[PDB]
Ligand code: HEM
Ligand code: HEM
């Protein structure tokens with residue numbers, strides 16, 4: 001019932017009790033582990049509310065108090081009458097920060113308690129959504145000194161009036177099929193780009209076209225808005241020793257902002273909850289730049305470096321990968337845009353894990369996602385056993401809207 | 408039931424049905440995933456079902472399921488169990504069993520090779536001296552002057568758990584580690600505890616940085632005995648770099664033969680507690696883990712120093728740069744000495760082709776992502792983007808307690 005995790009580099013053993021509070025399921029059974037799979041009424045709602053409020057009143061050291069009982073009563077009354085309830089500001093803020101705290105795939109959680117929460121529950125139209133989002137972008141960007149933020153649109157009602165941001169991240173590059181057979185821009189975004197074109201977007205058809213936002217209010221048809229170009233901070237990618245690197249013409253955006261997830265707090269579902277922090281370098285340099293299905297630049301870099309590309313065993317891919325990653329970090333640092341390297345981020349996460357075990361009795365973590373996509377075992381997280389389980393409040397995946405929406 | 412896995416780079420989707428034959432537990436439940444946890448005397452009552460499951464698999468593999476030969480063998484084994492409480496495998500069954508334990512090893516990236524395994528049947532062995540001779544022969548055969556051949560040697564099975572055959576070494580070839588009074592370590596820090604046992608048992612330690620450890624061998628539940636492997640049988644590779652001439656002066660070398668000796672082979676309910684097996688290295692096992700783990704030879708600093716990298720901040724990626732150079736050196740050295748080695752790109756590419764073949768012909772391939780993905784350059788190998796299913800099939804290799812923790816000393 002009480003589970004141990006061991007770090008194999010330091011011999012440190014921690015005991016997890018927090019997992020006994022887990023509510024959602026993992027995908028795994030006693031016969032099969034699905035650890036590497038990417039995507040595995042009134043009656044239900046009051047239990048979920050009580051569970052949340054119980055944890056909230058516990059957190060402010062007021063469990064079993066008058067105010068605790070009074071709120072449980074109030075929310076009970078409200079669900080009985082209206083079939084839903086509204087969070088107090090304090091509850092919403094606590095809930096958002098805890099969804100981040102519980103995000104088992106996030107290495108950056110040492111930061112969880114410093115999250116600026118923008119309450120957009122008063123929003124009613126797509127134009128309002130656009131206004132809130134520009135404000136979030138500008139606040140979070142802060143001229144390169146990035147601050148973590150989330151903007152929370154109105155909660156699901158009957159599911160026919162959902163707020164959604166159709167974009168997967170607030171800031172991303174277009175992707176286009178070429179008559180050439182190849183792909184121009186970001187190949188991950190071809191489908192969404194086509195939907196944008198279909199909804200009317202005049203596509204520039206370049207390599208780094210920032211996508212417009214496709215916003216849906218109150219379950220209405222989504223509408224198009226261009227983020228003011230002056231609010232989208234981008235960084236030209238250059239290398240501190242290779243003068244030719246800049247001639248590749250690469251750049252990336254400074255603000256990582258996930259917009260397609262669902263925030264569940266005390267049974268309530270917030271289907272539009274864009275959130276942002278700052279990048280870990282490998283996200284851009286390993287994944288964005290080097291994935292086969294992404295910008296896929298390894299061959300070009302290796303050629304300019306004049307590496308022996310004859311045989312895999314010269315490790316030319318590995319050498320080119322490291323240099324691309326050096327260039328990403330150097331370019332962000334030179335332009336003074338917050339970025340963390342994988343060594344510093346994983347060291348921080350180990351400290352955070354130790355804090356959470358000491359202070360909460362555990363930390364759900366998904367090793368498959370926490371370990372960086374390069375140089376795994378020279379980071380301390382590689383040697384750290386982790387237990388993965390689902391706690392609420394939480395961020396969840398949800399179906400892409402174009403499959404769900406009735407026009 | 409059907410389970411689908413997706414490759415996120417190629418969009419290829421595979422369907423697993425083989426998981427339906429899984430038996431042993433994973434450690435996970437619907438409430439917790441234990442996928443990154445490293446370590447998650449029978450009754451005749453349990454034994455016959457296990458024997459029968461095995462013999463049914465074996466007889467199906469030779470296209471004789473339900474034949475007279477299959478039935479007679481079931482009968483013969485059943486009678487042996489009720490009369491002697493155990494049974495003996497035929498040579499053919501032992502070979503099939505050992506190959507399949509490798510085929511079923513979900514943490515092994517090298518499984519494309521599973522059908523090419525030389526099986527040495529050491530079930531007639533009775534003494535520690537006998538064990539030493541068997542292991543020397545295995546080492547010489549497998550080494551084959553650098554043209555490495557996979558092999559396993561199988562000592563007598565467990566009887567009552569009081570007469571176990573065991574190789575106390577975790578691997579047949581490993582370097583000693585010595586803790587100094589000032590707290591520093593000479594040699595391999597992973598092997599300090601075991602080195603101390605060897606010394607205690609009477610080994611004369613040369614006390615250098617690369618001393619090949621003696622074998623400590625237990626036959627039939629007796630106290631283990633020390634033996635030195637003839638040095639001429641121990642193939643080693645000096646590590647040098649193709650461009651950096653100062654690399655050789657680090658004084659590094661590694662042995663060519665990776666040979667695991669501390670695992671337990673289960674076939675048809677029988678337990679082979681001494682079953683050393685060997686293949687050839689993937690470069691990262693030496694260049695990433697052995698050379699660069701903080702708790703191993705830990706050479707990253709010295710290498711980056713000699714490369715004159717900016718070491719004042721981690722964000723220069725000096726560790727990553729030195730890491731690649733060290734791995735280049737290991738592959739270069741082995742290749743130059745004509746000692747079999749595979750790089751992590753080649754190995755993972757071959758693993759994906761193997762995995763796809765297994766899905767098509769066998770209905771699945773249990774694989775542990777956490778172990779399959781190499782410890783450097785993860786996402787530029789094809790396994791990183793491959794969804795995998797992890798489950799336990801028998802025959803299998805299993806961990807077992809270290810024998811120094813369980814052995815009853817005779818004196
Ligand atoms: C402050 C700096 C932050 C860093 C350095 C960071 C780091 C990361 C990284 C590297 C990942 C894996 C991303 C990938 O490989 O695609 C991740 C996942 C995630 N992070 Fe963060 N994070 C940060 C802030 C945040 C914030 C502010 C939130 C929410 C309030 C958050 C919630 C998540 C979630 C839910 C995931 C998993 C999402 C998914 O499954 O796709 N993180 N984080
Ligand atoms: C032929 C060349 C082979 C290569 C390149 C290879 C590759 C690997 C690698 C890289 C690992 C992970 C090692 C680690 O991180 O400690 C591994 C694990 C393993 N392989 Fe192999 N393998 C080979 C042959 C074999 C053979 C011959 C067997 C047994 C017959 C085998 C069974 C295993 C098992 C059971 C594990 C899990 C080990 C453990 O849990 O400690 N492999 N393989």
Ligand SMILES: Cc1cc(N)nc(COc2cccc(OCCCN)c2)c1
Nearest residue numbers: 038256257258275276277278279280283
């Ligand atoms: C807030 C934040 C900061 C940061 N440095 N990185 C991230 C990236 O997190 C995500 C969020 C959503 C999706 C994602 O990619 C993989 C999921 C594809 N199905 C990755 C998010």
Ligand SMILES: Cc1cc(N)nc(COc2cccc(OCCCN)c2)c1
Nearest residue numbers: 577665666667684685686687688689692
């Ligand atoms: C046969 C074989 C070939 C090859 N290339 N690599 C292996 C390594 O497998 C092992 C065996 C024993 C232990 C291990 O990892 C844990 C380290 C504890 N000594 C990993 C085995």
Ligand SMILES: C[C@H](O)[C@H](O)[C@H]1CNc2nc(N)[nH]c(=O)c2N1
Nearest residue numbers: 036037038368369791792793794
């Ligand atoms: C199949 C596998 O689950 C998939 O490639 C995962 C592996 N680990 C990851 N880790 C992070 N941080 N981000 C990812 O997108 C992935 N992809």
Ligand SMILES: C[C@H](O)[C@H](O)[C@H]1CNc2nc(N)[nH]c(=O)c2N1
Nearest residue numbers: 382383384385443444445777778
């Ligand atoms: C804690 C974690 O399970 C542990 O460090 C694992 C991770 N992946 C590994 N992968 C391989 N091949 N070998 C290992 O020893 C490990 N160690």
Ligand SMILES: [Zn+2]
Nearest residue numbers: 028033435440
């Ligand atoms: Zn699992």
